[PDB]
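Entry, Tuesday afternoon. Goal for today is a structural model of the target with fe (iii) ion bound, before we commit to ordering more compound. Inputs were pasted exactly as handed over by J.K., no edits. I checked the ligand SMILES twice against the vendor sheet because last time a stereocentre got dropped in transcription.
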Amino acid sequence: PSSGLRMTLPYGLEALEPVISAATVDFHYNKHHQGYIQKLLDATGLPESRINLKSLVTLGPDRAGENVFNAAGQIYNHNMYWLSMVPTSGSGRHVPPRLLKLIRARWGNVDEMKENFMRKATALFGSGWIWLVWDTRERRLDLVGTKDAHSPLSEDAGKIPLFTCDVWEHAYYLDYQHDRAAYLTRWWSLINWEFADSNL
Amino acid sequence: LRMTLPYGLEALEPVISAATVDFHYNKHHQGYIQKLLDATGLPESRINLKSLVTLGPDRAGENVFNAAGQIYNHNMYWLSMVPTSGSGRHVPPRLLKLIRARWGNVDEMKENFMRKATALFGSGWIWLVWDTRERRLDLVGTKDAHSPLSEDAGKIPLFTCDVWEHAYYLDYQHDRAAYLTRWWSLINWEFADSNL
Ligand SMILES: [Fe+3]
Ligand SMILES: [Fe+3]
């Protein structure tokens, strides 16, 4: 699901309320997220059926071309993001024991984890993304920031993406304006911990 | 305290909304002032804004730089605009002949501005600069908190259009182009020309 050009929203536009308004999901998904799709079609000139999304993201902005990469990267990223949140009446809010043991090993308990995430996620300067990753080189969880359209996948340095929080101002500005931390504290309550564990 | 707004919050309507000027200026712009003080541990009296900007993030340190650059960039941003009631003024004759020299007329400049300002990916800024090395007007984009002042090669900033989404999101959402063509009517040519 997480791969693939044209991912359908796995839920309604208001299913993230009251953390992220219907208005925000509407613009984020139907404007930003779709815009990137056309954008990638226009920049490759390829038909949908010929585009391998992850392959472009790993290829990188140099080999793929800045604008092919920014588009593809943004699609992969936005894919991961919608998948990272549980709607109202979804499931996935509970931490599978497997992932839970790993997070306790890194940070002690989830409270400590949230606190490092808030620290790193508020400080990220500019347009970017926050990722929980599993570091394969080091066999441990970690929190990583990437800029613009970059990712653990495009950095291709052994870090496997588990979840992502969009930190571009378009992700929260309608709802929280300058107050990214307010957005972040509440986006935590949305995490699909199941999905995260499944990327292990 | 670097700085004060020339107009009231509503002075840029209908291009930019009172709400956007309030958040942009009172939370965003002003907020970096208290970030700068802390990151440097210095008082207002002991901080030279341009000094830290031209130092860059390696010399000044990442947070000092990001903050000082944003106070400078925003200082330029507000002064690059005039109230919509003051719109439509002639570009001073000295600036105009430089514009024509470069792009034929202003309309062709504007088209170049739209192309560059619409393509900048992520957060950043669009500047009109005098290119000392090249003896001519130019339009450039810089990323995040960077600026022609940061670059320090020889490009003098004449005006800036803020292109971070906070600049336009409440009014135009994803539609940056829409923000861009209308922002153009607000350009403070007096300021721009005065910056040569
Ligand atoms: Fe986004
Ligand atoms: Fe700004």
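Residues 61 and 69 of chain A are 5 Å apart (CA to CA).
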